[PDB]
């Protein structure tokens, strides 16, 4: 259940013998999710359960892809100003983020993520909060000012 393949993080600080489930607060205005607080999953890279600390900067984005295990692709859309023509142009760049199983995401959901230490070759952000959002058409084709 909690672990199926040959994979279990110790969940350091869980304590199993004497003590008096482990979770942190993350802070920064975010609320540790109830599913994280009372769940059974074990994630080494979860902001609320593992060793990772959220520090750096906070960003928002559309979930573009959730096809890999516990990580997602977040596309951030923004307007780049071209001085010569005195107008803007739509520009984008997608960033990969880790997504703990406490969060339930789909393509098109709007997530706010916080920077953490480099967890893989390309991921440096952990999703801190998810809001459901219905998308019509391709998620890449969507454009949101965040």
């Amino acid at each position: 259940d909690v672990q199926h393949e040959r994979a279990y993080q110790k969940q350091e600080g869980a304590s199993f013998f004497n003590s008096k489930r482990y979770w942190k607060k993350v802070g920064l205005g975010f609320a540790t999710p109830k599913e994280a607080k009372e769940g059974v999953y074990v994630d080494k890279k979860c902001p609320f359960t593992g060793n990772v600390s959220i520090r750096g900067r906070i960003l928002k984005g559309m979930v573009i892809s959730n096809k890999m295990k516990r990580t997602i692709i977040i596309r951030r859309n923004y307007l780049h100003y071209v001085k010569k023509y005195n107008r803007f142009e739509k520009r984008h760049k997608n960033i990969p983020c880790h997504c703990s199983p406490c969060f339930d995401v789909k393509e098109g959901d709007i997530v706010t993520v916080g920077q953490c230490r480099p967890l893989s070759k390309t991921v440096r952000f952990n999703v801190l909060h998810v809001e459901k959002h219905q998308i019509f058409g391709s998620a890449r084709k969507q454009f949101v000012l965040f």
């Binding site: 199993f16 013998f17 070759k121």
Partner: protein, 171 residues
């Protein structure tokens, strides 16, 4: 030996300048065998010494349900979650599963509790069966190629049941 020469995030090849720096370094692995204690000294950055253990046979091992540690000797290597070649060649790594002599622990139990702080944890049958066998299962918890010593803890409960099932619906 770190950082560059990989493909970009997109899959594009990156033109390389900036020939290899020393601080990337990348020393060869320590394949810590099981045998007579020999370690070597590695001078890392800042003249900080790292103890690369070529072979160990004993180690500090902890009974965690009682929160004690006693110095025992490693008998055999029986599992590791990574490549099976490591157990087959009997190499000690940070999460290896080893067979540990139980006698120091059983003697300590006799001396402190009597009969075979916050005491009286009631024990379990699945571990004292191994104790009667004389040899017990333990998981390494240190990094022998980094600290120069193999230390670990007895596995009990669900994790022990898991590892026993993995070692032995099964053959």
């Amino acid at each position: 030996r770190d950082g560059r020469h990989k493909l970009r995030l997109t899959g594009g090849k990156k033109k390389i300048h900036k020939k290899k720096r020393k601080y990337e370094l990348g020393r060869p692995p320590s394949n810590t065998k099981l045998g007579s204690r020999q370690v070597h000294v590695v001078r890392g950055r800042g003249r900080n010494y790292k103890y690369r253990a070529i072979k160990l046979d004993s180690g500090s091992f902890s009974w965690p349900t009682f929160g004690i540690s006693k110095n025992t000797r490693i008998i055999d290597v029986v599992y590791n979650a990574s490549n099976n070649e490591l157990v087959r060649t009997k190499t000690l790594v940070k999460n290896c599963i080893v067979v540990i002599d139980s006698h120091p622990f059983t003697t300590w139990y006799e001396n402190t509790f009597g009969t075979t702080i916050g005491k009286s944890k009631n024990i379990d049958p699945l571990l004292l069966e191994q104790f009667k066998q004389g040899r017990v299962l333990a998981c390494i918890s240190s990094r022998p190629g980094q600290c120069g010593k193999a230390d670990g803890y007895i596995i009990e409960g669900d994790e022990l049941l898991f590892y026993k099932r993995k070692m032995d619906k099964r053959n």
